[PDB]
Amino acid sequence: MTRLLVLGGTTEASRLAKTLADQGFEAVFSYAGRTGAPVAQPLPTRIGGFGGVAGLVDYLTREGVSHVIDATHPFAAQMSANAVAACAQTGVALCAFERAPWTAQAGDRWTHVPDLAAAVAALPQAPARVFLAIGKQHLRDFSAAPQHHYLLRLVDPPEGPLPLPDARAVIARGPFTVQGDTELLRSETITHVVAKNAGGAGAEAKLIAARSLGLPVILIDRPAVPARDICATLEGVMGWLADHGATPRGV
Ligand SMILES: C/C1=C2/N[C@@](C)([C@@H]3N[C@@H](CC4=N[C@@](C)(CC5=NC1[C@@](C)(CC(=O)O)C5CCC(=O)O)C(CC(=O)O)=C4CCC(=O)O)[C@](C)(/C=C/C(=O)O)[C@H]3CC(=O)O)[C@@](C)(CC(=O)O)[C@@H]2CCC(=O)O
Ligand SMILES: NC(=O)c1ccc[n+]([C@@H]2O[C@H](COP(=O)([O-])OP(=O)(O)OC[C@H]3O[C@@H](n4cnc5c(N)ncnc54)[C@H](OP(=O)(O)O)[C@@H]3O)[C@@H](O)[C@H]2O)c1
């Protein structure tokens, strides 16, 4: 019998959790605990790491998980690799719920770089006004280009000093809206946006906002992850679960 684990942290994961609850599945939602107080989900929620591959193996076994939906961020590549390894070791079925990368349309002015360090190298020499729309974990990389003014967007207020000599943070969590990000990029007079190619619904706003302002985006390509089934849409996840024998409680 069916007991799902949703590895979360995305808008996709939240939409899936709502669906799973509404359809009466037995399921647990998992956060890493990267933020101080993550928003509530409509499933019993675990918070914290598993202890690597071995730890996740152990959890899947003791919890009696039948299926894992990896709905983590596309750039949370360690978690995603760990899930491929732990599910292969235990024989638990796994699908990653991740949408196609975002692709450029009319009016976008995008350049692509392979990783965060290359995004730092992409910035111009002369001081600019750069929206580092990349969260918290890798802000320090931009200490290699300290001359810019940086706009940061952080879930929690910083405790430590920031590694950037000219920076302001907004304290906010998404989902973000086009209206909201337009006003931010205007008010801060941003010249350049740095973004990871998440592909998700929750942080596409900054790209549309940039397009409305005529601004360039330096877009970081997704990191390598080992092969596993990919469920690209919510409907895809629900078909995959049905196909692999997951059923709800029957309420
Ligand atoms: C957009 C977005 C982003 N999150 C960042 C900020 C990444 N999100 C977190 C952790 C995190 N975000 C929360 C709100 C979840 C969401 N963040 C979203 C969603 C809105 C969408 C998503 O990501 O699909 C969403 C889901 C909200 C939902 O619909 O419910 C959350 C839970 C909660 O606190 O309420 C947790 C703890 C998760 C956990 O413990 O498992 C990281 C890891 C830490 C941020 C911090 O501590 O300030 C950071 C990436 C990083 O720093 O490298 C960024 C930049 C990813 C990126 O590069 O795209 C990007 C914002 C880019 C910008 O500013 O445009
Ligand atoms: N760019 C982004 O990561 C972005 C945006 C919104 C959310 N996030 C979310 O923020 C979280 C942290 O991402 P990250 O960049 O730190 O990932 P990561 O580098 O891939 O993960 C590092 C370690 O954190 C633990 N972890 C990650 N996601 C977890 C989850 N959902 N449940 C339980 N443990 C988890 C695992 O620890 P153990 O090996 O100890 O198990 C993992 O090995 C994830 O839930 C992710 O979806 C990331």
Numbering used by the authors: 1 to 51, 52A, 53 to 251
Provide excerpts from the study.
The electron density at 1.32 Å resolution is excellent for the ternary complex with clear density for all residues, product and coenzyme with the exception of the nicotinamide of the coenzyme which is less well defined indicating its mobility. The clarity of the electron density map of the bound precorrin is remarkable. The product bound to CobK has been further modified by methylation of C5, this is a modification that can be accommodated within the active centre of the enzyme and points to the lability of the intermediate through the crystallization and data collection steps. Comparing the structure of the ternary complex with the holoenzyme reveals the ordering of the β2/ β3 loop, residues 33 to 40, across the substrate binding cleft. The propionate group on the C-ring of the tetrapyrrole appears to be important in closing this loop (an inventory of interactions involving the loop is presented in Supplementary Table S2). Note that it is the binding of product that promotes loop closure even though some of the contacts are to the coenzyme. At the active centre of CobK the coenzyme and product are held with geometry and relative orientation consistent with the hydride having been transferred from C4 of the nicotinamide to C19 of the precorrin-6B product. In the trapped product complex, the C4N of the pyridine residue of NADPH is 2.8 Å of C19 of the D-ring of the corrin macrocycle in agreement with the previously reported stereochemistry of hydride transfer. The product is almost entirely inaccessible to solvent in this time and space averaged structure and only the proprionate of the B-ring can be seen emerging from the substrate-binding pocket.
In this paper we investigate the structure of the precorrin-6A reductase CobK involved in the aerobic pathway, there is a homologous enzyme CbiJ involved in the anaerobic pathway both enzymes catalyse the NADPH-dependent reduction of precorrin-6A5 to the dihydro derivative precorrin-6B6. We have determined the structure of apoenzyme, holoenzyme and a ternary complex with NADPH and product giving unprecedented insights into the structure and mechanism of CobK. CobK comprises two domains, a coenzyme binding domain and a substrate-binding domain, both of β/α architecture. CobK unusually comprises two parallel β-sheet domains arranged so the β-strands point towards the centre of the molecule where the NADPH and substrate bind.
